[PDB]
Amino acid sequence: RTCGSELNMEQIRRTEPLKYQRITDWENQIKLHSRSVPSSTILIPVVVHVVYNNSAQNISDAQIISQIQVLNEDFRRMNADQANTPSAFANLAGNANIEFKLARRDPNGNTTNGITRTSTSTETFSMEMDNVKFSNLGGNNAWNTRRYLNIWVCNLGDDLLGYAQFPFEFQTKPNTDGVVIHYKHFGRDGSAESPYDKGRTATHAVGHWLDLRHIWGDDGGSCSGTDNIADTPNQGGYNEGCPSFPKTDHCTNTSPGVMFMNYMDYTYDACMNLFTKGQVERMRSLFDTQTGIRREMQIYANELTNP
Ligand SMILES: [Ca+2]
Ligand SMILES: [Ca+2]
Ligand SMILES: [Zn+2]
């Protein structure tokens, strides 16, 4: 799996010192800014922006609805492959109690189905430029990011599957908040290409938009990096493909080993099947009713997801 949302803290400390300070401040303050976390279902209004240069990139409404179905399964532990979670880890599995619905009202109060379509001359979008998120750069401007989760679907090229913007970046980069997914790996079955054809590229990206990090700590295989989640076993490097349970490494050398079936690893879509309770706590904390950075999204979520 390829992803543009790695946080190699050793590298960031040297290459991006202001970003290092911002991430460290966010983590020092995350416990003090998560007391009024909601006890009820969190609803996320979604807008999907299809940005296409050709017919293959202009994916079907059914393809998009299947992706929303997958998010609602994975974030509510309603994925049928939950049964595949090894019994040693199933007791750590979390139910995020987060729902996703396509928007029915656009930012001007007009009816919408929550899908936009933008033809473009851009052949390939760049994560570096964030050009898919700007109408003037060949993409499509975000819908009010305080109220909608914006998911852009486009051609990210031969390598990149998707990328997300993290919550610590919301204050300074509000208009680029959201997630971008490669069109070939959006939705389940249908036009999606194996082995990333079960909609988990977006489950993984939405996990980053909800403050989660790669489970192995983005540290080049060492045991020094962390995902800041105590119930995800310390893990060396990423896993790819479809490992066999149990898989141990130099960070967790005893069975049950590393949680390679966590959505925040780099494994194939069909071999992923859980978030942990600790990851759920972190994601839900962003909706703390008094100080949660994404709390406003809950104020008008019902209004925006009904006709
Ligand atoms: Ca961990
Ligand atoms: Ca590691
Ligand atoms: Zn990632």
Numbering used by the authors: 21 to 327
Task: Give excerpts from the publication.
Another unicellular pappalysin is the T. forsythia KLIKK MP mirolysin, which protects the bacterium against complement-mediated bactericidal activity. It is secreted as a 66 kDa zymogen (see UniProt code A0A0F7IPS1), which when activated cleaves several physiologically relevant host proteins such as fibronectin; fibrinogen; complement proteins C3, C4 and C5; as well as antimicrobial peptide LL-37. As part of its virulence factor armamentarium, at the site of colonization it secretes mirolysin, a metallopeptidase of the unicellular pappalysin family, as a zymogen that is proteolytically auto-activated extracellularly at the Ser54–Arg55 bond. The catalytic domain conforms to the metzincin clan of metallopeptidases and contains a double calcium site, which acts as a calcium switch for activity.
